[PDB]
Amino acid sequence: HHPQQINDIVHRTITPLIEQQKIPGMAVAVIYQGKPYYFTWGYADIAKKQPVTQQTLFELGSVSKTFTGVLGGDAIARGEIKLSDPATKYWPELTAKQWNGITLLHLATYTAGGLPLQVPDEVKSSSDLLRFYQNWQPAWAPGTQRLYANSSIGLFGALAVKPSGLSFEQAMQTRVFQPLKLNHTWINVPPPEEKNYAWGYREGKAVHVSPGALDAEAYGVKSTIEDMARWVRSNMNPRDINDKTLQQGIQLAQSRYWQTGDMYQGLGWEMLDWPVNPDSIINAAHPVKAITPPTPAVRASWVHKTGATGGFGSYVAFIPEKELGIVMLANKNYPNPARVAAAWQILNALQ
């Protein structure tokens, strides 16, 4: 059952969005008074006329970084890592002098001094990855500039799980996915779930994301609209979580570590004070101001993350103090401002 208020606002906003953006398939969850309401449109596979369902898997792209941030928070809560730890503590083979003074905090929050947006495609092995980072030259001193980048938080994720004894995949499954009952969320889609894996569409072609080094950490997660609704609810209400270090980790990922303009950098998540200027949630390196100690999570925030792959576009946003949130998953990568304006209209209407 849907409250009519929710059906009305979703139809008024998402139907025109799909009409304008030519999105083949889409799933939306609205979290309202903490409870989820689901909507699906169109096709997961156009050539077979296979409909989007609540079990359809979508590529999350950089929304994956929120899982990584929370897993990192959980490691912090366990005392397995500190954000002030040097990167070299967890990877002593990283001997180049430019790595002196670079911390896990820098890696997690894109402030190491200009690590590249992309890990080079030909990097395959551990020795390849080492050689990549060993020859990187910073454009800036650490902790001065934010350059949003996969190679930064991707390495954070890989290093953060070293004290656990587990692989990144094993740590994520056991410490985050399983406690939160995300049973249809995958770093690697298993064979019996391939029937539910949507195709993305780019320039008229059915596509899936390409494998790359540190993809699991930076952009590789696939999930359903139901699990993503569960993810939003968990990040809005950590107090309801039995796993103590996960509860803490979720809170730590919404701590405010850096400020640029009216945006605050968390771990994976990005935050702004609510109410927001829409200009700010719609919008190169930017200077950052450190926040020390980091501000504990502010419930009166717009918390959000966008993600894209070649064939998919994702958006998650929520306002903890209002128990209000939205997940938008689509198998076309369409412009961020269209996504965000629609989300902003919907969440404003449900206050």
Ligand SMILES: *P(=O)(O)OC[C@H]1O[C@@H](n2cnc3c(N)ncnc32)[C@H](O)[C@@H]1O
């Ligand atoms: P977020 O969705 O902001 O970014 C992650 C997406 O960026 C693309 N990406 C990461 N790494 C590469 C490489 N090496 N080459 C081409 N594209 C890359 C993917 O679309 C990620 O999903």
